[PDB]
Amino acid sequence: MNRKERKSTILETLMGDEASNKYFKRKYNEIQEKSTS
Amino acid sequence: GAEKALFRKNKGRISRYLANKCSMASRIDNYSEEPSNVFGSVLKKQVEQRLEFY
Amino acid sequence: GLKVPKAVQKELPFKSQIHQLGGDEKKARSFIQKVLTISKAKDSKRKEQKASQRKERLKKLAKMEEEKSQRDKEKKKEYFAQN
Amino acid sequence: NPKAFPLADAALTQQILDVVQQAANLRQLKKGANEATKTLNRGISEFIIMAADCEPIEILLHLPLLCEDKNVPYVFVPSRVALGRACGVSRPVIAASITTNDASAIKTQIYAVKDKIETLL
Amino acid sequence: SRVKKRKKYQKAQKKLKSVRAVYSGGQSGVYEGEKTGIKKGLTRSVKFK
Amino acid sequence: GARGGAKVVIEPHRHAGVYIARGKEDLLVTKNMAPGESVYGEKRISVEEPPTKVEYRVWNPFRSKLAAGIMGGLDELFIAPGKKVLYLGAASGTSVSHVSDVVGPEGVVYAVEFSHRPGRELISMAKKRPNIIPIIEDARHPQKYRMLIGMVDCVFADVAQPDQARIIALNSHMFLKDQGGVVISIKANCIDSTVDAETVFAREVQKLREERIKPLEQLTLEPYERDHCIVVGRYMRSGLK
Amino acid sequence: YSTPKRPYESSRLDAELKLAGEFGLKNKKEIYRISFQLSKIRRAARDLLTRDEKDPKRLFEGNALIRRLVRVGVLSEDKKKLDYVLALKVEDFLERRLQTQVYKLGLAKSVHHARVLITQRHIAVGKQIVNIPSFMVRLDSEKHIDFAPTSPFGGARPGRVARRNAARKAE
Amino acid sequence: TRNIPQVSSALFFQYNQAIKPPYQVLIDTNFINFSIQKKVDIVRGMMDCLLAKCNPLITDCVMAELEKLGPKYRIALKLARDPRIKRLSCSHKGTYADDCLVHRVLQHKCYIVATNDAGLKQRIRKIPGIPLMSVGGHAYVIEKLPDV
Amino acid sequence: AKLVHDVQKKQHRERSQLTSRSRYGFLEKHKDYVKRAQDFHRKQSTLKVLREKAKERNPDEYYHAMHSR
Amino acid sequence: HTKRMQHVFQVKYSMDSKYIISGSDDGNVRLWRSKAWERSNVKTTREKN
RNA sequence: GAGUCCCAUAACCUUUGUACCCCAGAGUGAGAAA
RNA sequence: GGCCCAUUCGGGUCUUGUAAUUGGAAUGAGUACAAUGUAAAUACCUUAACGAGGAACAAUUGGAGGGCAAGUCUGGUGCCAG
Secondary structure (H helix, E strand, O other), rough: OOOOOOOOOHHHHHOOOHHOOOHHHHHHHHHHHHHOO | OOOOOOOOOHHHHHHHHHHHHHHHHHHHHHHOOOOHHHHHHHHHHHHHHHHOOO | OOOOOOOHHHHOOOOOOOOOOHHHHHHHHHHHHHHHHHHHHHHHHHHHHHHHHHHHHHHHHHHHHHEEEEEHHHHHHHHHHHH | OOOOEEEEEOOOOHHHHHHHHHHHOOOOEHHHHHHHHHHHHHOOOOEEEEEEEOOHHHHHHHHHHHHHOEEEEOOOOOOHHHHHHHHHOOOOOEEEEEEOOOOOOHHHHHHHHHHHHHHOO | OOHHHHHHHHHHHHHHHOOOOOOOOOOOOOOOOOOOOOOOOOOOOOOOO | OOOOOOOOOOEOOOOOEEEEOOOEEEEEEEOOOOOOEEEEEEEEEEEEEEEEEEEEEEEOOOHHHHHHHHHHOOOOOOOOOOOOOOEEOOEEEEHHHHHHHHOOOOOOOEEEEOOOHHHHHHHHHHHHHOOOOEEEEOOOOOOHHHHHHOEEEEEEEOOOOHHHHHHHHHHHHHHEEEEEEEEEEEEEHHHHOOOOOHHHHHHHHHHHHHHHHEEEEEOOOOOOOOOOOOEEEEEEOOOOO | OOOOOOOOOOOHHHHHHHHHHHHHHOOOHHHHHHHHHHHHHHHHHHHHHHHHOOOOHHHHHHHHHHHHHHHOOOOOOOOOOOHHHHHHHHHHHHEEEHHHHHHOOHHHOOOHHHHHHHHHHHEEEOOOEEEOOOOOOOHHHHEEEEEEEOOOOOOOOHHHHHHHHHHHOOO | OOOOOOOOOOOEEOOOOOOOOOOOEOOOOOHHHHHHHHOOOOOHHEEEHHHOOEEEEEHHHHHHHEEEEEEEHHHHHHHOOOOEEEEEEOOOOOOHHHHHHHHHHHHHEEEEEEEOOHHHHHHHHHHOOOOEEEOOOOOOEEEEOOOO | OOOOOOOOOOOOOOOOOHHOOOOOOOOOOOOHHHHHHHHHHHHHHHHHHHHHHHHOOOOOOHHHHHHHO | OOOOOOOOEEEEEEEOOEEEEEEEOOEEEEEEEEOOOOOOOOOOHHHHH
16 A cells, blocks of 8 residues: 555544445445334 | 666666566576676677667 | 333332443544444344244254154054064 | 486477477467466466577576476476477477466376376476 | 256356355465454364274 | 555464464464565564564465465364474475474474475575574485484475375384374375375375374365365374274 | 166266256256266176186277277277276266367357357368267367358358348448 | 364265276175175176276274174185275274274265165265165165266 | 146235325234234233232342442 | 184294284284283383382 | 653654656566568 | 355355346348259258347246235134134
């Protein structure tokens, strides 16, 4: 990786990616539609 | 040697070209118990001919 | 949820009495509560899936044992027919 | 003793090139040293053919170090110039390698030469 | 019948992979670690008694 | 995946001297005798510990058969801290360096190889690892280098020949302890290509048994290699019954 | 062909599954045909084996048999003995089916692609266009498998759909 | 350290692609006795039943069991010692042959088992992809051998 | 499936509540009620034990932890 | 004795007098200790006494 | 009363400046020139 | 998420699923200018043109399971069971 990408925690590296965060926001919103039903 | 530009579109072609000559030269030196410079001279001369051509 | 009457709650013995950083971190804390919700639901859907085939499995197993239970009966009719 | 060793005789070279020349027709042949270096590290090579008359011979003596470290049979043959003719390319070839495919139409031929090669080594 | 058997076999090859690992050319590219986890308390060795 | 600037959680393995580096993926990892470099370009871990920067090396199963053997779930690996190991077939430090990692500074590794070209590299690696003695010599005649070898608690063999079993017998007889360890990697094609691999696997086992080796375990090295197993045994001179 | 002694063995059924999938056979009938031929040839070799060595019948018939088995390509040249005939398996014959060579030589990328190409009159052995996939190729015939000259893939004009689409593009 | 044995790499479901001619048959004690009763040669009959060269193996356990039988079965001992029969060494204390054959079969999957004991036969039937050989009527019969 | 047509095995759709009754809510079904009945019985059963549990309480019971709680 | 030996036809003493060699018609040559309770291992002076 | 002991003699981010870069990677593998 | 084992609890394995969209090629049945064939003729073989996405140019037979109603019938110890 580029030196900028290396982070002092995995969560920071994980939270850096855009595809993963989008997937969770969509999927998490789905569950409440089931959970809050 | 691409991180410190040791070997350095036409400019790249010589780099790809010269890199091969470094590779073969390493073979000649590495496995010869007492390597000579006779091949290195002509191999460099071959690079010079290519340099002029491009 | 069930609500115990306080009259019932009061007169019970000892053993069983019912006992009655912001900014980036918030985005990084709501995120952790986000994912753990994913895994629990995913596990619960995979786990319930398993029990569904388990009910199917014990059923298809049950039709073999009865065939195995019954056919043994005739073998002991023909065997003791000789005896 | 010689650096180019073992060197196949007039006979054993014969079946080798026959495998090489056909293997070219079947796109199973990687031709020349850097492809030979290529295949060894990826471990897709049956065995490697080297020309013993190569100028200089040491340009390819690195391949046996790679070959036997990966436990891949190898051999030397007299004339590079003949190998290109077998290989089907219009230039001499100093090194060649046969790639791995158990679905090749010539698994028996390749294994036949391979067995002889192991005995030679 | 040909097409039906074709899908049958490729399905079976998949099933073979689940019951046991099946060789797939070794490693291709950089070694990315074990995809699915290393199980510490697990031996799959056949024991000589 | 296992990319440089990323971090992993390194943890002990069941076999002493081996570790697991966890993360998005996991890696079999062994601690480096020689921090600061890789013997064959393997991947390496660096940890700050009170602060000293201890280093570890990643172990590639597809390159080393022993590593793949651990991963198949080998129950007993005699190679461990503070134990003498005789590695037959020391082509290079690809596996020997990792074995040298497992034994530790107290232990030693007796590396045996025949050909000269790989031995030069083995010598070069073996120097940076003081616990490694490179015995470039034919294993078929242990009497040649009996002078250079004492007792070894475990003998590991990666030697690829048709006549492996006899080689194991001699080396085990001369140098291995009683009740000592033996670990053999068997390639079917090298021994007998005419017959299926599985037949060779049984045949070699019997050769071990008549050589007074009670074999303990056998594991196929799927998926890392085809037609291979690691056979683990104990050298019980007294009686295999 | 002849039916097997016990068609319903699970090991058997998996056997035909593997064989058909890896060789793209239409049904079990081809497998039993090949098994019947293998049984006959192996029984003949067995009976010859029973005969005394140097028996004129053993020598003559065994020699002719091994030479034929070499010519069909199942038995390798270095394995010219009746014991190796006895060691044969149906897979060797099935390899010798034309489908397998069309696939393995690279003309087709799959056994099914080979089947369709063969039945489509795109494959020629020498002068003869063969549309019988069960055709058994010999060693000499193996090297002459090519695209038939009349085929669009074999040197002829484009097929009906190709020229039709080219025309529709034209206007 | 909980342990799950791997299924043999030789096996595709219930099919043993690994077994190919010539075969290995492990001989059980009863199999000799019934063979003599039916006047069926050990080697010829196998090669007839299976239409392949057969390499019979007698382990130490079964050899001990035969020669335990006594003077009545000295013939069986003699036939069991035929040179075409190869012998297989063992490394376990018990002379019980039934378990020894089973253990070898679970572990190595090229072996045919020649036996008539009803107790043994079902067990080898449960073990997947193990051809079962027996003598019945006037010649041998092979049950779980796809190649026949 | 023996001797049955696929027409014999046909799906019957579920009728909905009257638009006049839309305010009050969904139309319950047999499946819906068995959830209601089961939940009620479970709660009553646990309440049933608690009452019996209270009645047989011994006033002289002593457990040491009362000095704390 | 044992079941496995069927008729003794050759019996010999090991030339060191420590073992007995027996040959029977069952086809096996058996070795026996001259004294069943004695063991061939070298003993300590304490054990010897 | 109170973590020196993770170099405020420092780390990280932002701005500015200087010098270079915009090829494949387990790189491809027979064309190029006319 | 898929799949495997397991009476039991549970255990084991990883590129999978589509009941999603889309592209250009190949050609047989057929239909047929013909020729050949034949006492003549059918058929076979050869061969102009047309001849495929639901390629509707719409092969079957048998077996194992589901699930659904403001539906219906029957025995009961509510709300169950068949």
